[PDB]
Structure 1
């Protein structure tokens, strides 16, 4: 299953801007629903931990089952802070790599590109948005697809690339030079709360 409902409603429920523009939050920064505009009681600790868990999974557009399995893998990693490793794996997810490279404006758009197969890894077609992208693997657009307005517009519009990504405009090929650092990731999200949530 893939979520398709309104994007602004989800972002404002989480209280942070998923797209990062802040456009959703700017106007009417209330939780969705008729009781959102009026003052609401404080949230319990469980609610706070749940909200952080939802923040990450809604950011990357994943379902709970896949999210849970990914967290377990992050735990298996031996070195480094557990929450940091989990966020690193979330980044390496194939959809996010396309999004970071800027071939798509949004993660939904990057996901649809991957699903329709316009992307290729190391010159090979890959239709699995869930695909794990290692450091140094070259993500490129399918040659037939290179001449489509959507991806070209996204490239020209995206002006800021994270340090860890290296991209080439003409070739439309990118790759992660190194694993993203904690501060490079979203700081507003607190990985410790998610860790404790799944500790249950």
Structure 2
């Protein structure tokens, strides 16, 4: 499964945008349902760690088993911290590479582009979105049929291109220069609440 629901209730429940600052929390910044505008008392310190974890899980649209295995894998580095290495491994998945490069507006669109077989790493096609893109691998746009309507238009309007992403808008090749850093990556949510959430799992 992935998810198909209204995708905007989700942001109103975390209190974070999740869609490139394009405002879902413009009107009614409160939660969904009857008891939306009428908030109530405090939230535990279990609700806080759960809310941080859900923020990160819904950012990149993955499921709970895969999230937890990625977290367990990031723990075997021991070079740096354990939340930084996590949120950095999270960025190296082929879906974020298409999002950051700029071939798609959303992450759902980028996911459908990499699922339906329209992109290639090093020339060879790769079809599965949880792929692990390493540093220095020019991912391309299937030079067979790169004349599609939405890819073309979403290359023009560059809302955000980062300081670790390289790209050329003629051959349509991009790559990571090097690994990013927390200052360059959502210094807003957390990586410590999420680490504590998995201590008693």
Q: TM-score, normalised by structure 1?
A: 0.97
Tell me which residue corresponds to 1:101.
101
Give yes or no for contact 2:100–2:160 (8 Å, CA) kept in 1: no
Q: How many residues align?
A: 200
The answer as to 2:48 corresponding to 1:48 is yes
2:33 aligned counterpart, secondary structure: coil
1:167 aligned counterpart, secondary structure: strand
Deviation of residue 41 (structure 1)? Answer: 1.9
Structure 1 residues 109-130: Cα deviation after superposition (integer angstroms, max 9, x where no partner): 1000000011111111111100
More helix as a share of residues? 1
Structure 1 residues 28-67: Cα deviation after superposition (integer angstroms, max 9, x where no partner): 1111212121122221111110111111110000000000
Q: CA separation in 1, counterparts of 2:22 and 2:52?
A: 18
Deviation of residue 22 (structure 1)? Answer: 4.2
Tell me which residue corresponds to 1:79.
79
Q: CA separation in 1, counterparts of 2:116 and 2:26?
A: 33
| Residues 1:145 and 1:45: Cα distance change in structure 2 (over 3 Å) | farther
Q: CA separation in 2, counterparts of 1:26 and 1:64?
A: 29
Deviation of residue 177 (structure 1)? Answer: 0.5
Q: CA separation in 1, counterparts of 2:190 and 2:31?
A: 20
Give yes or no for contact 1:105–1:158 (8 Å, CA) kept in 2: no
Q: TM-score, normalised by structure 2?
A: 0.96
Q: CA separation in 2, counterparts of 1:188 and 1:25?
A: 17
Give yes or no for contact 1:9–1:31 (8 Å, CA) kept in 2: yes
1:53 aligned counterpart, secondary structure: helix
Range with greater deviation from structure 2 (10-19 or 31-40): 31-40
Structure 1 residues 112-152: Cα deviation after superposition (integer angstroms, max 9, x where no partner): 00000111111111111000000101111111331001111
Deviation of residue 197 (structure 1)? Answer: 0.5
Deviation of residue 183 (structure 1)? Answer: 1.0
Give yes or no for contact 1:49–1:193 (8 Å, CA) kept in 2: yes
Tell me which residue corresponds to 2:162.
162
Q: CA separation in 2, counterparts of 1:116 and 1:32?
A: 33
Q: CA separation in 1, counterparts of 2:64 and 2:123?
A: 31
Range with greater deviation from structure 2 (100-109 or 145-154): 145-154
Range with greater deviation from structure 2 (139-148 or 44-53): 139-148
Structure 1 residues 61-81: Cα deviation after superposition (integer angstroms, max 9, x where no partner): 000000000000111112011
Which runs of no fewer than 5 residues in structure 2 stay unpaired?
none
| Residues 1:122 and 1:176: Cα distance change in structure 2 (over 3 Å) | same
